Design a protein around this ligand. Structure first.
Ligand SMILES: [Mg+2]
Ligand SMILES: [Mg+2]
Lengths: 707, 707
């Protein structure tokens, strides 16, 4: 009979309910380490037998004898040496290497104050980290650059799979790093209203069609203290992505992407001189090419590497030869409608209407690559023999689930974390020879046990093309009566790189979904064309017209709801954030007779205010696609607003500048339409922490008053 | 049966209704000039006989012979020479002097492009004007100052009656001007969201308790082209106000006010050297002193001048001696609780529980000063003989009305513009010997003739002190039934320098008052203690605690409404702008059991964000009044919000920085209270033009949905 509140359903809530977990669970060679608050256990994967390693009292005793501090829990320890009985942890910025068979502090190192993006190399003992805009290795500064130059940090606004800007050589003798010059990029003025006098907080923001930032790759030698830069030419309008090292540390590889994002090149550079050594492979597509993963060399054969490509329509593994730049190249057409320039023998290791979501690593003894594969609501772990191409089992044996994995040092065992509709969290140890569970580490209990909960249903309907199958999730209140009429709220995202309907826990339902469904509102979400884990054809159907085919598919979802007799067709609302915010506004403006109430958070209004990297991939430039930009500029449709639309924007949003929403307000004032607005001061793109509860109460209140 | 629309009732509306007027009505000596679109007439004041002077066709004929352009109407013509049959007008920035007896162009002058604040001196033919931050006289630049220096323009944020920064000598041979250095004042970042990339639009804004701007007075001679600056010492934390010239042009007078605004000094300076020549008079008050008018010399005796002071509790005329600085000074206590340092014989020309609102000028033959006097809803024109102090008639003969006047060159006749509850606009010529109407120039007809209109009632109730009488205005729908219950909307301002309930047209009702009253809402407004035209005691009751006594008085108004059987006590809303926005928020937070719904526009939230000049006058400094600032900081009461509060703020508001409202939103998020917000981009303190209709539709909609 008791229903959960927003305090129990929204992250940031005082009593937020979540399924039990095993934090810090990792590998020490081929032994599984299960940390706790007071003990660290070792688990033999073959048997599942738990052996105690060390207690926090024991470690703290030795830390106090060294005046090194105190641990509160053992969840943050790491085991980066397969052969040394050593542990690594941090206590107030200080790195401690601890021997757990002798109970001794091996070493301590404290980087300079204000250290971020710390990247430790176990093989050499070197640590790279950043202080403001400059890069540091151990006690020395690698760079001394002015404002506008950023070193050793992420570049190209985290696109093409870039998440860091430091790349240690396999043995830790050289460090590759990014050097970004943003000096020529426009600054957007955010205003801090908590200062004595409201101050400007400028952020570099490159908008579609304007001047971009320039990236350079440096190579630093900690033994000499000298750095070189790769001689790639004028870096203007070029992306330098997916940095990878040769196993011998003599050359560096990267994937270069042009500004039009339709041509990618796998390049080699000399690590000692920075001189180019050739192009091994080239990939082209009339729409776009999007490299997201570096090349991985075979641990048993450095003359071969695995490249990840969607050229046939799905992300798959391809085995290439290292000597490809010095062989005869031929041009080929690819199944995705693109083309590629390839030399040498290339072997497609994985094939089918599914994609590889992660390379987990290798089993060197059995010569296999272990990986995770996905499609729609299905996921699973797999192995493929690199020599013959024999796959462990067909993708068709996959169930609806969400799998995550961590491979042991020998590739013999796997930590398998998964969730299904009714199973919140299951953690098993899995044998990679036959993919059989060897031991259950956790089977989390339902955190909503003893609460009244809504029902969840998933299914498929056809897209606006009449052929593509779209997955939807439908939620109803617990006391649902099919004789009564109910209001509906469509939760929408619908942009690329995301999927709302999963095969995981509650089919991806969010806390607010649960909250509104229990308040008497039917909740609906459909994953339209453009969304992820369905291949490139499903995704690029939206090219140069973002939001259009997405809206058409969302309307097919509504036509399905209207066919249900318990749906009140005159009470359809819509809510989304970011791309979802654009979709909420666009649906209100393009289908004003369908959607009655809408709540749009941090939306994109005009793609001309959006970043170059993401924007120009799907929309090209305002100069190259003037029709696309006009059609998808929601300021042009401001006069179509009939219903209740609330726009929420955060004052320190540097993903969607606040200009989007205020320029939309001005357009409605001029057109004499009446949207509502709300600004969350001191919040970035999303409202985080306790204020996220305030946000969901405000959203709930808007739908209760107007739907 | 037809009701007016917001398009007919709101300025900026497409069909805005207003009472007929006579634009450009002025004096050519003692002849009254009535311009029109096609003709200029002359009116003999004794008789009221209209004589044609000239036609637009005649003037345009002569302008075309001189290639000087074309006039579209004769409303912008001026007659600054009493003895020359000449006119002044401007065609596309070009000044033209025209003789209307001979039909000849006398001269043309075109100032540099981008000219503003043009100040023409008919006696010398010189014109001063500004281009950006610099001052110009005729063809030459007086100043060449960098960013942060402003010359020849208004200073001290238009306080102490400063409305310009150029002051010509009586014969036009010297120009006194302001030079303001703002370089040391903090810049507030406003953001222009119409730019390609949202840009910063900085404004200098000095906040209470912080570093102020510095003002200097320059004296420029157009014949020599040289300037001198008054040697007043370090200008830090001093106000230089009410600049006035000696009749012989040999010295300049000003009133200096300290930063604590409790000590004023009448000062003389040599016009040739800029050297100080003494202090003639000093005025002190424990609360504040506020000089707002320069001294005026008697046209028949330059050894005497009239000073305007509230030292006895009401603004009155005092006759002083020019030789006062060189006489024996004594300190005296004043009836307002202040003190003054005075030398020589001083004569109080006007006395009573009423104030002088304007010195219209003089009748030199009869030795009288003509002036307008006000108190509450009462107004009138008066003469006092400067020699014997005999007043034309007692203030008690005044009726409820709003009078405005323009005196002829000899002070024999007056243009009297007035309004009463039911008379929208009456314009008469009045004989200043007996103040009898000599001719009716206009008796405007009601612009709402043929419309359904609400009823208007005025009365008085006692203030929260139990002794002071407060004027209120009550409006009811036309079909009002005293058997039914009605919702009420309190319109509030309540700050100093303003009065809402007048003796003029509709007792000061505004368009939106009319609109809501006709929609079935009772409208109520009360002029609380702190408001103007009631003397200093009524006003400074709020000193150091702005909003507190004002709220108490607004609540006495509500206790009156609750005593009316046709008022629904459970449906009371409130609306105000600026000080009224503060009042709306404060009333919602301090009396949450009284006001159900509120709409606050461009409010003051924290007095620490408000300007030095106005703020420190009534609140002192945050360091001098920490309790006052804490109590009146509405962020401190954020947790008290129970009802529906909408805060509207304009993104380019440089009166109330947008920081006020955004810092209030943050405080409510933190306190878990739910106010609503709206931002009008590209609007200053008030929404002007067609968007003002959008603003009033949004305000109407908020009250219809929630009250
Ligand atoms: Mg492109
Ligand atoms: Mg003071």
């Amino acid at each position: 009979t008791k229903k959960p509140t927003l305090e129990e359903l929204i992250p940031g809530g005082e009593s937020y309910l979540y399924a039990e977990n095993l934090y810090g669970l990792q590998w020490w060679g081929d032994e599984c380490i299960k940390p706790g608050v007071d003990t660290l256990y070792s688990i033999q994967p073959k048997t599942g037998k738990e052996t105690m390693v060390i207690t926090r009292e024991q470690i703290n005793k030795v830390l106090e004898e060294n005046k090194a501090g105190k641990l509160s829990h053992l969840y943050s320890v790491r085991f980066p040496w397969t052969d040394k009985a050593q542990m690594l942890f941090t206590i107030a910025g200080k790195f401690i290497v601890y021997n757990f068979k002798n109970n001794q502090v091996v070493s301590t190192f404290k980087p300079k104050d204000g250290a971020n993006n710390e990247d430790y190399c176990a093989a050499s003992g070197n640590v790279a980290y950043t202080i403001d805009n400059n890069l540091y290795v151990n006690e020395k500064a690698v760079t001394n650059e002015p404002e506008g130059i950023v070193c050793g940090q992420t570049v190209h606004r985290n696109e093409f799979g870039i998440n860091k800007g430091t790349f240690w050589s396999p043995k830790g003798n050289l460090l590759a790093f990014y050097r970004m010059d943003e000096s020529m990029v426009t600054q957007y003025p955010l205003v801090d209203i908590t200062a004595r006098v409201g101050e400007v907080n400028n952020v570099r923001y490159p908008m579609a069609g304007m001047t971009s930032h320039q990236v350079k790759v440096g190579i630093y030698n900690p033994a000499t203290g000298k750095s070189i830069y790769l001689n790639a030419g004028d870096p203007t309008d070029r992306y330098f992505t997916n940095i990878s090292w040769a196993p011998d540390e003599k050359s560096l590889y990267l994937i270069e992407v042009n500004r039009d994002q339709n041509h990618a090149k796998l390049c080699q550079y000399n690590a000692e001189t920075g001189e180019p050594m050739g192009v091994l492979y080239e990939e082209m597509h009339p729409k776009y090419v999007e490299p997201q993963n570096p090349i991985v060399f075979l641990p048993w054969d450095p003359t071969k590497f695995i490249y990840q490509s969607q050229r046939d329509g799905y992300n798959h593994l391809y085995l290439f030869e290292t000597n490809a730049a010095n062989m005869k190249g031929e041009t080929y057409n690819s199944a995705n409608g693109g083309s590629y320039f390839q030399a040498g023998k290339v072997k497609q290791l994985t094939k089918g209407n599914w994609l590889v979501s992660e390379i987990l690593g290798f089993n060197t003894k059995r010569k296999e690559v272990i990986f995770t594969a996905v499609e729609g609501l299905r996921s699973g772990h797999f192995a493929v023999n690199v020599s013959n191409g024999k796959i462990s089992q067909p993708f068709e044996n996959c169930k609806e689930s969400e799998h995550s994995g961590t491979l042991s040092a020998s590739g013999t065992y796997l930590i398998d974390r998964y969730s299904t509709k009714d199973q919140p969290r299951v953690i098993n140890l899995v044998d990679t020879k036959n993919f059989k569970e060897t031991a259950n580490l956790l089977t989390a209990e339902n955190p909503y046990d003893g609460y009244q909960m809504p029902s969840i249903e998933t299914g498929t309907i056809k897209a606006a093309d009449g052929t593509t199958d779209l997955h939807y999730r439908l939620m109803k209140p617990a006391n649902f009566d099919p004789a009564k009429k109910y209001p509906v709220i469509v939760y929408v995202y619908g942009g690329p790189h995301a999927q709302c309907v999963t095969g995981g826990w509650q089919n991806g339902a969010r806390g607010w979904d649960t909250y509104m469904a229990s308040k008497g509102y039917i909740m609906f979400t459909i994953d339209n064309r453009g969304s992820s884990n369905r291949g490139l054809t499903f995704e690029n159907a939206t090219f140069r017209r973002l939001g259009i085919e997405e809206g058409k598919d969302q309307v097919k979802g509504v036509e399905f709801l209207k066919s249900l007799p318990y749906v009140d067709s005159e009470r359809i609302g819509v809510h989304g954030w970011s791309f979802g915010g654009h979709m909420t506004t666009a649906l209100m403006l393009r289908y004003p007779e369908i959607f009655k109430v809408g709540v749009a958070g941090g939306p994109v209004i005009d793609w001309g205010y959006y970043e170059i990297m993401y924007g120009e991939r799907y929309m090209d430039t305002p100069e190259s696609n003037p029709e696309g930009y006009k059609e998808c500029n929601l300021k042009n449709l401001a006069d179509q607003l009939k219903g209740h639309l609330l726009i929420i924007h955060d004052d320190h949003d540097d993903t969607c500048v606040p200009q989007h929403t205020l320029s939309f307000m001005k357009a409605c004032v001029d057109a004499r339409t009446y949207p509502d607005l709300f600004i969350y001061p001191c919040h970035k793109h999303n409202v985080a922490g306790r204020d996220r509860v305030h946000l969901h109460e405000k959203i709930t209140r808007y739908f209760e008053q107007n739907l």
